[PDB]
Curated annotation (Swiss-Prot), chain B:
<comment type="function">
    <text>Involved in the biogenesis of the 60S ribosomal subunit.</text>
</comment>
<comment type="similarity">
    <text>Belongs to the TRAFAC class OBG-HflX-like GTPase superfamily. OBG GTPase family. NOG subfamily.</text>
</comment>
<protein>
    <recommendedName>
        <fullName>Nucleolar GTP-binding protein 1</fullName>
    </recommendedName>
</protein>
Length: 148, 55, 324, 177, 66, 88
RNA sequence: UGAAGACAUUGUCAGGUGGGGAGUUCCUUUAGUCCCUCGAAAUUUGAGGCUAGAGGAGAAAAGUUACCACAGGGAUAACUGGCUUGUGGCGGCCAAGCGUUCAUAGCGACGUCGCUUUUUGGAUGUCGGCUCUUCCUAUCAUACCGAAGCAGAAUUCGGUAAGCGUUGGAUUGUUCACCCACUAAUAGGGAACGUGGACCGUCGUGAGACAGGUUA
């Protein structure tokens, strides 16, 4: 039935479809070991943000971010790629939490609208907790277990 | 390539290369059946008579 | 059949059955189908010029030089423009950085256009979450007079103040209050602006949650809250002033429970209110009676905006004048 | 809910006179008789009208957040600061103005210090450490800061050198969003 | 000078207990997350989205209605 | 080299008077100069410090006279307020 | 006694505020009562009251942060050396055995399933460039065979094999990819990666500068 659920979600997505960078910014700032670049994967969200000076010089590289995560649902035994909403708590470092570093066991907020789980009052949920449970620096693909 | 360019350790490169080669291996593993079909069509199209429609 | 159409629409589009029933009641099958196609279709993005800082042709020339494709938004809005494509991001362009313009929707055009602020006037805005409405009142009045802005939340409040200081309003006092509390606390404003929080059925392209994240419980509590909101606004408004002052109600909900019903309730409760022609060129007539519920025939002047008729967000307007 | 005290408004006018000239014009009576009076809430100072303060005092201290235009906040050591929120009055009553180009203003809006190639035209008789207001080509107030050196030394210095110590600019507004 | 002398004579130990605290904190974090998973698998019953409160706060509130 | 404010050095009765001094660490009093005239007095002293050295005796004298007028107006307003408080 | 003139104006209360002045030393989080009040709603909800679970010297300035700049202190002298290669990760199913007492406290390979992943076919900073010797094979060619719808020819894969030889142009900061020209063929590497600034400061602290020096 996992094939059926994945096919339904993918077909819904297909039908719906059918119907400056921080690095160059910091280079310009330098022109106009002082630089630290984060070597761990992160998530930004909005396309352009000018960070407060407390975190301005924490550069994060272009490729290392990941927009979507592979979320596995403990019940119904289905795994689907879903967009990452935001990063909430990285137990390794509060600084990593604030930046958005995606380490092992890190809980983020994930959009589960595609899954369509029904909550109390016969109501649907859009955003839920998911624990990143792999080592994305070891394996670029970012995998989480949903919390239901 | 970007991940390896920003890699920071030997074990980092270890697991990154292993993961990439695993991705290609799994892709071919799913491509298992088209290869058989295309081999069969290749064999017949080779053992196909060649006429000249114009002549 | 009606049930077959309801099931087909729910299955194919993902709408809740109850909201689908309301929308089917609201629009005939052709108009309903057009409405659903429109509201899944993304809306265009418009830009409002800062008349205090620059003017339309200069801003348009600058954005053409920077490679932004622009088109004036109808004859109705002189201050507005519509974006087709932009090589440079709209966020990072020098005009936006200096405050020459803002990004918004035509539904953000319509209500302050209904309002007619004048110089040296006292104005209120109990819901200005993006701040565009307060900024546009400031642009209309040329930074003459006083603006009071009320908000519930610190987050959209700081977004508001960022927008205000970026656009250089210079005469707004920004506060975190209750909208119901505002009249008793201060009251006595020449003009008042209410963008009442609603179900959000108007813009599901912006809020895809409303497609399902709207139950009967919300449909019951929300109109009561906006009822108290209009009670607060009519308490705030001044009956007599040297410059005529009017109440403006704007909402982004299309369901009838949110539209024309609460304003009928306010009109029935307070005789001091009359409704005048809101002054908006394109719109749809307000319904005299919808579900066995008689509404005052004067609601004819009330305008409605639909995505399917016009490439605008689903939007609702009402304008009132106070006697005593 | 207090007006400023002696040393507080002394440091405030110290900064405001280092940056502006006509503080008489700022605190001078108006036609109606209303006056612009300094306010300070939560260790943060604001510029408001006296009538505005009178009509706003009716609110409880905790619930009210902003009033008039924010000028700045005082640090724990007592050092007073003026911000991009106080930029407009500073531009209105600026003593020294320095104008920059677009290619130099863009790093200025980012947060970079002013370079000699950035400025378009110069103010005359500028002291070494005097405060100044940085405009663009369109006379749009971009920021403020303390110059690294005087106009003549800027003339005879290398184009790549730092010109003004970039204090605060439009960055603060979109920082909060 | 007294304070500097104490800091110099302490030295290593400050760092040692710093890492000990930083690992005990992460142990508590993992334990709390495990409690979250256990209680939520056993039961629950939320709204549409996450509670607006940052973490540690939502987790004590959920443990509270436990 | 350490800050005199941090250093617990008592004030000394030199030519400049100590006057009445607050008890240490307990509720330093608050005096408001919210009056526009007091604003002008302190601002004029600030501008005097800003101008500093001048090459004209007449200009120095007129500067001093203006800020003296500032104190005079401030004192007159304070006396008027004291009279009003005595009435009330 | 005249004037402005129903504009101003004053007083009355119902509010709110108040760190300024005086004097002293409850609110926060949760659930219920769905009881009472105020509302809404064609009859059910919303907001208070009530109840009971857990919290708590004062205007001078403070507490606190895996944060910033600065100055300083502390710690490690530095890395790998049977390390390196060709086969991903997450979750489930299955699973011999072992285990706290037994495949269920539980650990647990190979496979399969779901996500990446599907219905019409450019990346690269300093470098290099040439030659020569030697060595390894993880072999481009020459030799040898095993397999393939391998009719022939031309081939592909596999292995035994280091004796043999292993050229250019475009393009580029420059290399490879790709592209094209010869040619049996233009294969990969090793040879201790084989031979030819930082303080003394001075002037600034919302940011820096110095034809200043001590000089290693």
């Amino acid at each position: 039935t996992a094939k059926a659920l994945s096919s339904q979600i993918k077909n819904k997505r297909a039908e719906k479809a059918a119907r400056i960078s921080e690095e160059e910014m910091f280079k310009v700032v330098k022109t106009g070991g002082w630089k630290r670049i984060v070597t761990k994967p992160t998530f930004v969200g909005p396309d352009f943000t000018r960070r407060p000076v407390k975190y301005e010089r924490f550069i994060r590289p272009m490729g290392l971010r990941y927009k979507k995560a592979n979320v596995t649902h403990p019940t119904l035994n289905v795994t689907v790629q879903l967009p990452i909403l935001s990063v909430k708590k990285n137990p390794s470092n509060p600084l990593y939490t604030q930046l958005g570093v995606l380490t092992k066991g890190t809980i983020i907020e994930v959009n589960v609208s595609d899954l369509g789980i029904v909550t109390a009052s016969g109501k649907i949920a859009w955003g839920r907790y998911a624990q990143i449970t792999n080592n994305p620096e070891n394996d670029g693909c970012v995998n989480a277990v949903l919390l239901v | 390539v970007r991940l390896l360019k920003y890699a920071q350790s030997l074990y980092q490169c270890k697991q990154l290369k292993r993961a990439a080669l695993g991705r290609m291996a799994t892709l071919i593993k799913r491509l298992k059946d088209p290869l058989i079909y295309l081999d069969q069509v290749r064999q017949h199209l080779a053992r196909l008579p060649d006429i000249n429609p114009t002549t | 059949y009606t049930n077959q159409l309801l099931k087909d629409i729910c299955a194919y589009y993902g709408y809740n059955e109850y909201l689908a029933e309301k929308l089917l009641n609201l629009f005939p099958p052709r108009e309903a189908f057009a409405f659903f196609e429109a509201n899944e279709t993304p809306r265009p993005v418009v830009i409002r010029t800062n008349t205090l800082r620059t003017h339309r042709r200069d801003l348009a020339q600058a954005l053409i030089n920077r490679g932004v494709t622009l088109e004036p938004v109808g004859k109705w809005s002189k201050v507005g423009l519509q974006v087709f494509d932009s090589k440079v991001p709209l966020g990072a362009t020098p005009e936006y950085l200096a405050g020459h313009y803002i990004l918004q929707a035509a539904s953000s055009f319509l209500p302050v256009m209904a309002l007619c602020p004048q110089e040296n006037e006292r104005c209120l805005d109990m819901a200005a979450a993006p701040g565009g409405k307060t900024t546009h009142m400031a642009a209309l009045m040329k930074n003459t007079g006083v603006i009071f802005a009320n908000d519930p939340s610190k987050s959209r409040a700081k977004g508001l103040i960022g927008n205000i200081h970026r656009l250089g309003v210079r005469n707004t006092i920004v506060c975190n209050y209750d909208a119901r509390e505002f009249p008793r606390v201060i009251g006595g404003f020449d003009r008042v602006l209410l963008d009442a929080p609603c179900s959000g059925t108007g813009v599901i392209c912006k809020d895809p949650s409303v497609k399902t994240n709207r139950d009967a419980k919300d449909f019951m509590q929300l109109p009561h809250t906006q009822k108290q909101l209009l009670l607060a606004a009519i308490d705030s408004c001044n009956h007599a002033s040297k410059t005529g002052g009017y109440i403006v109600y704007s909402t982004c909900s299309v369901c009838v429970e949110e539209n024309e019903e609460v304003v009928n309730y306010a009109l029935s409760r307070r005789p001091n209110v009359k409704l005048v022609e809101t002054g908006l060129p394109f719109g749809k007539e307000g319904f005299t009676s919808y579900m066995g519920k008689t509404f005052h025939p004067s609601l004819k002047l009330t305008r409605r905006f639909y995505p399917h008729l016009y490439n605008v967000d689903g939007f609702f307007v009402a304008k009132f004048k106070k006697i005593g | 809910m207090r007006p400023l005290t002696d040393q507080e408004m002394k440091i405030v006018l110290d900064k405001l006179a280092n940056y502006m000239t006509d503080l008489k014009s700022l605190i001078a009576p108006l036609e109606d008789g209303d006056r612009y009076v300094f306010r300070m809430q939560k260790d943060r100072v604001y510029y408001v009208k006296l009538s505005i303060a009178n009509i706003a005092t009716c609110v409880a201290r905790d619930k009210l957040l902003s009033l008039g235009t924010c000028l700045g906040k005082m640090t724990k050591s007592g050092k007073f600061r003026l911000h991009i929120t106080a930029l407009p009055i500073l531009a209105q009553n600026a003593r020294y103005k320095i104008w920059v180009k677009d290619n130099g203003a863009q790093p200025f809006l980012y947060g970079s210090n002013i370079v000699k190639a950035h400025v378009g035209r110069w103010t005359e008789d500028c002291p070494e450490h005097s405060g100044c207001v940085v405009y663009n080509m369109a006379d749009i107030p971009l920021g403020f800061g303390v110059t690294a050196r005087s106009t003549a030394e800027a003339r005879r210095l290398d184009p790549t050198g730092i010109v003004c110590f970039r204090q605060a600019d439009c960055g603060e507004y979109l920082r909060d969003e | 000078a007294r304070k500097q002398r104490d800091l110099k004579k302490f030295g290593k130990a400050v760092q040692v207990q710093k890492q000990l605290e930083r690992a005990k904190q992460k142990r508590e974090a993992l334990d709390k997350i495990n409690q979250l998973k256990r209680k939520r698998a056993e039961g629950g019953a939320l709204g549409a989205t996450e509670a607006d409160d940052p973490f540690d706060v939502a987790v004590d509130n959920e443990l509270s209605r436990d | 080299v350490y800050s005199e404010k941090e250093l617990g050095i008592p004030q000394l009765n030199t030519v400049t008077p100590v006057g009445v001094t607050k008890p240490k660490g307990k509720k330093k009093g608050k005096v408001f100069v919210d009056d526009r005239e007091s604003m002008n007095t302190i601002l004029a002293m600030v501008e005097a410090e800003k101008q500093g050295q001048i090459e004209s005796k007449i200009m120095r004298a007129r500067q001093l006279e203006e800020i003296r007028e500032a104190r005079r107006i401030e004192a007159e307003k304070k006396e008027a307020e004291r009279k009003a408080l005595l009435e009330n």
